[PDB]
Amino acid sequence: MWDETELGLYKVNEYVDARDTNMGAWFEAQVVRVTRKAPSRDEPCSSTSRPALEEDVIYHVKYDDYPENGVVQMNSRDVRARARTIIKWQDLEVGQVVMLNYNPDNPKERGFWYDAEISRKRETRTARELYANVVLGDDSLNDCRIIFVDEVFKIERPGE
Protein backbone atom coordinates (compact mmCIF):
# COMPACT_ATOMS: atom_id res chain seq x y z
CA MET A 1 0.00 0.00 0.00
CA TRP A 2 0.96 3.60 -0.76
CA ASP A 3 0.18 6.75 1.19
CA GLU A 4 -3.10 8.37 0.13
CA THR A 5 -3.13 12.16 -0.20
CA GLU A 6 -6.12 12.84 -2.47
CA LEU A 7 -9.07 10.84 -1.09
CA GLY A 8 -8.97 10.38 2.69
CA LEU A 9 -11.81 11.90 4.69
CA TYR A 10 -9.70 12.07 7.86
CA LYS A 11 -6.09 13.19 8.18
CA VAL A 12 -3.17 11.76 10.11
CA ASN A 13 -3.44 12.81 13.79
CA GLU A 14 -7.20 13.40 13.57
CA TYR A 15 -9.58 11.61 15.92
CA VAL A 16 -12.47 9.49 14.66
CA ASP A 17 -14.86 6.78 15.76
CA ALA A 18 -13.66 3.38 14.53
CA ARG A 19 -15.63 0.13 14.44
CA ASP A 20 -14.15 -3.13 15.75
CA THR A 21 -15.45 -5.46 13.05
CA ASN A 22 -15.27 -8.44 15.41
CA MET A 23 -17.55 -6.73 17.97
CA GLY A 24 -19.50 -4.23 15.91
CA ALA A 25 -18.75 -1.66 18.62
CA TRP A 26 -17.45 1.87 17.99
CA PHE A 27 -14.40 3.31 19.78
CA GLU A 28 -12.57 6.63 19.68
CA ALA A 29 -9.35 6.28 17.71
CA GLN A 30 -6.57 8.41 16.23
CA VAL A 31 -5.61 8.12 12.57
CA VAL A 32 -1.90 7.38 12.17
CA ARG A 33 -1.73 6.61 8.43
CA VAL A 34 -3.94 6.81 5.34
CA THR A 35 -3.20 4.42 2.47
CA ARG A 36 -4.64 2.91 -0.69
CA LYS A 37 -3.78 -0.18 -2.71
CA ALA A 38 -0.66 0.35 -4.80
CA PRO A 39 -0.87 0.40 -8.59
CA SER A 40 0.86 -2.52 -10.26
CA ARG A 41 4.21 -1.98 -12.01
CA ASP A 42 2.37 -1.81 -15.34
CA GLU A 43 -0.57 0.27 -14.05
CA PRO A 44 -0.73 4.09 -14.02
CA CYS A 45 -1.44 5.96 -10.80
CA SER A 46 -4.63 7.39 -12.34
CA SER A 47 -6.21 4.35 -13.97
CA THR A 48 -9.11 4.29 -16.41
CA SER A 49 -9.94 0.70 -15.45
CA ARG A 50 -9.71 1.17 -11.65
CA PRO A 51 -10.48 4.79 -10.72
CA ALA A 52 -9.52 5.77 -7.20
CA LEU A 53 -12.44 5.78 -4.76
CA GLU A 54 -12.73 6.85 -1.14
CA GLU A 55 -14.42 3.54 -0.31
CA ASP A 56 -11.07 1.84 -1.04
CA VAL A 57 -9.05 4.02 1.35
CA ILE A 58 -7.53 2.24 4.36
CA TYR A 59 -7.23 4.12 7.65
CA HIS A 60 -4.58 2.99 10.13
CA VAL A 61 -5.78 3.88 13.63
CA LYS A 62 -4.80 3.46 17.27
CA TYR A 63 -7.64 3.17 19.78
CA ASP A 64 -7.46 5.93 22.37
CA ASP A 65 -8.42 3.67 25.29
CA TYR A 66 -6.58 0.58 23.97
CA PRO A 67 -3.05 1.61 22.97
CA GLU A 68 -2.20 -2.02 23.81
CA ASN A 69 -3.92 -3.07 20.57
CA GLY A 70 -1.33 -1.34 18.41
CA VAL A 71 -2.16 0.02 14.96
CA VAL A 72 -5.26 -1.47 13.30
CA GLN A 73 -6.12 -1.18 9.60
CA MET A 74 -9.70 -0.01 9.00
CA ASN A 75 -11.92 -0.24 5.95
CA SER A 76 -13.39 3.17 5.13
CA ARG A 77 -16.86 1.99 6.18
CA ASP A 78 -15.51 1.34 9.70
CA VAL A 79 -14.35 4.93 10.35
CA ARG A 80 -16.58 7.97 10.78
CA ALA A 81 -16.72 11.34 12.51
CA ARG A 82 -16.93 11.20 16.30
CA ALA A 83 -20.45 11.08 17.73
CA ARG A 84 -21.49 14.42 19.23
CA THR A 85 -25.27 14.98 19.03
CA ILE A 86 -27.82 13.45 21.40
CA ILE A 87 -31.28 12.48 20.22
CA LYS A 88 -33.42 13.56 23.17
CA TRP A 89 -35.83 11.00 24.62
CA GLN A 90 -38.80 13.01 23.35
CA ASP A 91 -37.38 12.90 19.79
CA LEU A 92 -36.61 9.16 19.69
CA GLU A 93 -38.82 7.22 17.27
CA VAL A 94 -39.19 3.60 16.23
CA GLY A 95 -37.21 3.06 13.05
CA GLN A 96 -34.40 5.50 13.80
CA VAL A 97 -30.91 4.07 13.27
CA VAL A 98 -28.72 5.44 16.06
CA MET A 99 -25.65 4.76 18.19
CA LEU A 100 -26.36 3.70 21.76
CA ASN A 101 -24.80 1.90 24.71
CA TYR A 102 -25.64 -1.73 25.41
CA ASN A 103 -24.07 -4.70 27.21
CA PRO A 104 -25.08 -7.94 25.44
CA ASP A 105 -23.79 -10.17 28.24
CA ASN A 106 -25.35 -8.19 31.12
CA PRO A 107 -28.10 -5.97 29.73
CA LYS A 108 -28.53 -3.93 32.93
CA GLU A 109 -24.84 -2.93 32.99
CA ARG A 110 -22.82 -0.39 31.06
CA GLY A 111 -21.57 -1.87 27.80
CA PHE A 112 -20.23 -0.68 24.44
CA TRP A 113 -21.38 1.72 21.72
CA TYR A 114 -23.34 -0.04 18.98
CA ASP A 115 -25.41 1.00 16.03
CA ALA A 116 -29.02 0.00 16.55
CA GLU A 117 -32.50 0.45 15.10
CA ILE A 118 -35.07 1.63 17.65
CA SER A 119 -37.77 -1.04 17.78
CA ARG A 120 -40.10 -0.10 20.67
CA LYS A 121 -40.69 3.01 22.78
CA ARG A 122 -43.03 3.22 25.78
CA GLU A 123 -43.46 5.57 28.71
CA THR A 124 -45.32 5.90 31.99
CA ARG A 125 -45.01 8.60 34.65
CA THR A 126 -42.35 6.45 36.34
CA ALA A 127 -40.62 4.56 33.50
CA ARG A 128 -39.15 5.29 30.07
CA GLU A 129 -38.65 2.03 28.16
CA LEU A 130 -36.51 1.87 25.01
CA TYR A 131 -35.90 -1.23 22.90
CA ALA A 132 -33.67 -1.59 19.86
CA ASN A 133 -32.24 -4.15 17.45
CA VAL A 134 -28.51 -3.93 18.22
CA VAL A 135 -25.96 -4.61 15.47
CA LEU A 136 -22.98 -6.74 16.49
CA GLY A 137 -20.08 -7.88 14.30
CA ASP A 138 -21.80 -10.66 12.35
CA ASP A 139 -25.32 -10.73 13.82
CA SER A 140 -27.99 -8.51 15.30
CA LEU A 141 -29.72 -8.88 18.66
CA ASN A 142 -33.40 -8.11 18.29
CA ASP A 143 -35.56 -6.41 20.92
CA CYS A 144 -32.81 -5.45 23.38
CA ARG A 145 -33.84 -3.32 26.36
CA ILE A 146 -31.69 -0.17 26.29
CA ILE A 147 -30.96 1.18 29.78
CA PHE A 148 -29.18 4.39 28.80
CA VAL A 149 -32.10 6.18 27.15
CA ASP A 150 -30.67 9.69 27.62
CA GLU A 151 -27.40 8.84 25.82
CA VAL A 152 -28.62 7.92 22.33
CA PHE A 153 -26.44 9.53 19.65
CA LYS A 154 -27.04 10.55 16.06
CA ILE A 155 -24.78 8.76 13.58
CA GLU A 156 -22.58 11.29 11.78
CA ARG A 157 -22.92 11.11 7.98
CA PRO A 158 -21.21 13.62 5.67
CA GLY A 159 -23.54 16.29 4.34
CA GLU A 160 -26.35 15.18 6.65
From Swiss-Prot:
Post-translational modification: Ubiquitinated; which leads to proteasomal degradation. Autoubiquitinated; interaction with USP7 leads to deubiquitination and prevents degradation. Polyubiquitination may be stimulated by DNA damage.
Effect on the protein of changing D17A: Impaired binding to histone H3 without affecting the protein folding
Modified residues (Phosphoserine): S40
Glycyl lysine isopeptide (Lys-Gly) (interchain with G-Cter in SUMO2) crosslink, residue number(s): K154
Impact reported for D20A: Impaired binding to histone H3
Result of changing Y66A: Impaired binding to histone H3
Tissue expression remark: Expressed in thymus, bone marrow, testis, lung and heart. Overexpressed in breast cancer.
Annotated region described as Tudor-like 2, given as residue ranges: 91-158
Expression induction or repression: Up-regulated in proliferating cells, and down-regulated in quiescent cells. Down-regulated upon adriamycin-induced DNA damage, in a p53/TP53 and CDKN1A-dependent way. Induced by E2F1 transcription factor.
Region (Tudor-like 1): 8-84
UniProt-annotated location(s): Nucleus
Pathological association: Defects in UHRF1 may be a cause of cancers. Overexpressed in many different forms of human cancers, including bladder, breast, cervical, colorectal and prostate cancers, as well as pancreatic adenocarcinomas, rhabdomyosarcomas and gliomas. Plays an important role in the correlation of histone modification and gene silencing in cancer progression. Expression is associated with a poor prognosis in patients with various cancers, suggesting that it participates in cancer progression.
Domain note: The tudor-like regions specifically recognize and bind histone H3 unmethylated at 'Arg-2' (H3R2me0), while the PHD-type zinc finger specifically recognizes and binds histone H3 trimethylated at 'Lys-9' (H3K9me3). The tudor-like regions simultaneously recognizes H3K9me3 through a conserved aromatic cage in the first tudor-like subdomain and unmodified H3K4 (H3K4me0) within a groove between the tandem subdomains.
Subunit structure: Interacts with DNMT3A and DNMT3B. Interacts with DNMT1; the interaction is direct. Interacts with USP7; leading to its deubiquitination. Interacts with histone H3. Interacts with HDAC1, but not with HDAC2. Interacts with BLTP3A. Interacts with PML. Interacts with EHMT2. Binds hemimethylated CpG containing oligonucleotides. Interacts with ZNF263; recruited to the SIX3 promoter along with other proteins involved in chromatin modification and transcriptional corepression where it contributes to transcriptional repression. Interacts with UHRF2. Interacts with FANCD2.
Role, per record: Multidomain protein that acts as a key epigenetic regulator by bridging DNA methylation and chromatin modification. Specifically recognizes and binds hemimethylated DNA at replication forks via its YDG domain and recruits DNMT1 methyltransferase to ensure faithful propagation of the DNA methylation patterns through DNA replication.
Protein name in the entry: E3 ubiquitin-protein ligase UHRF1
Natural source organism: Homo sapiens (Human)
Upper classification of the organism: Eukaryota, Metazoa, Chordata, Craniata, Vertebrata
Span of the entire protein shown here: 126 to 285 of 793
